[PDB]
Amino acid sequence: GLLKWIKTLL
Numbered sequence: 001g002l003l004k005w006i007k008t009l010l
């Protein structure tokens with residue numbers, strides 16, 4: 001999901 005994607009980018 002994009003939520004985990006954003007958390008990974010952070």
Ligand SMILES: CCCCCCCCCCCCOP(=O)([O-])OCC[N+](C)(C)C
Pocket residue numbers: 001002003004
């Ligand atoms: C995490 C949901 C945020 C909802 C508010 C934002 C909506 C507009 C942008 C789209 C955000 C998508 O996000 P995600 O991680 O791929 O959603 C996956 C959701 N399910 C597991 C139910 C399929």
Ligand SMILES: CCCCCCCCCCCCOP(=O)([O-])OCC[N+](C)(C)C
Pocket residue numbers: none
């Ligand atoms: C900020 C308040 C959030 C409330 C919780 C909302 C949870 C659901 C988020 C859903 C985000 C999009 O996910 P997705 O994988 O593209 O959806 C697959 C299904 N559709 C193609 C019909 C959108």
Ligand SMILES: CCCCCCCCCCCCOP(=O)([O-])OCC[N+](C)(C)C
Pocket residue numbers: 002
């Ligand atoms: C403050 C919160 C902000 C959250 C913002 C999240 C945005 C997530 C956007 C994810 C976009 C992923 O698009 P992609 O796979 O590269 O497709 C690009 C498609 N075209 C080639 C037709 C342009």
Ligand SMILES: CCCCCCCCCCCCOP(=O)([O-])OCC[N+](C)(C)C
Pocket residue numbers: none
């Ligand atoms: C938060 C954003 C996540 C996006 C992730 C998916 C990227 C790939 C999108 C591929 C579909 C691009 O056509 P659309 O946008 O449906 O065309 C809308 C415009 N018309 C009605 C004129 C056709």
Ligand SMILES: CCCCCCCCCCCCOP(=O)([O-])OCC[N+](C)(C)C
Pocket residue numbers: 007008010
């Ligand atoms: C602006 C670009 C800066 C580049 C430099 C990065 C420096 C290192 C930052 C390391 C941040 C590590 O992530 P975190 O806070 O533990 O996880 C954020 C997501 N959760 C809270 C859900 C776990």
Ligand SMILES: CCCCCCCCCCCCOP(=O)([O-])OCC[N+](C)(C)C
Pocket residue numbers: 009
């Ligand atoms: C609704 C549309 C409005 C227009 C949005 C225009 C802004 C699009 C920004 C797209 C930026 C793409 O960065 P990327 O290659 O994934 O790098 C991620 C960052 N690091 C390399 C440091 C990890």
Ligand SMILES: CCCCCCCCCCCCOP(=O)([O-])OCC[N+](C)(C)C
Pocket residue numbers: 010
């Ligand atoms: C509430 C949870 C928040 C989690 C936030 C996690 C991300 C932390 C990011 C830490 C940022 C560190 O920036 P800095 O060392 O000055 O590098 C900036 C480098 N550029 C100028 C090239 C972009």
Ligand SMILES: CCCCCCCCCCCCOP(=O)([O-])OCC[N+](C)(C)C
Pocket residue numbers: 010
């Ligand atoms: C750089 C820091 C970015 C922080 C982004 C925070 C986004 C939060 C989105 C939350 C949307 C709602 O989701 P939910 O399933 O009802 O949440 C249940 C969990 N809480 C009770 C803690 C909300």
Ligand SMILES: CCCCCCCCCCCCOP(=O)([O-])OCC[N+](C)(C)C
Pocket residue numbers: none
């Ligand atoms: C809820 C609001 C959250 C907002 C979070 C904003 C995050 C923005 C991340 C910005 C990441 C920038 O990385 P950077 O090393 O300069 O990129 C690579 C650039 N060079 C190729 C020139 C080295």
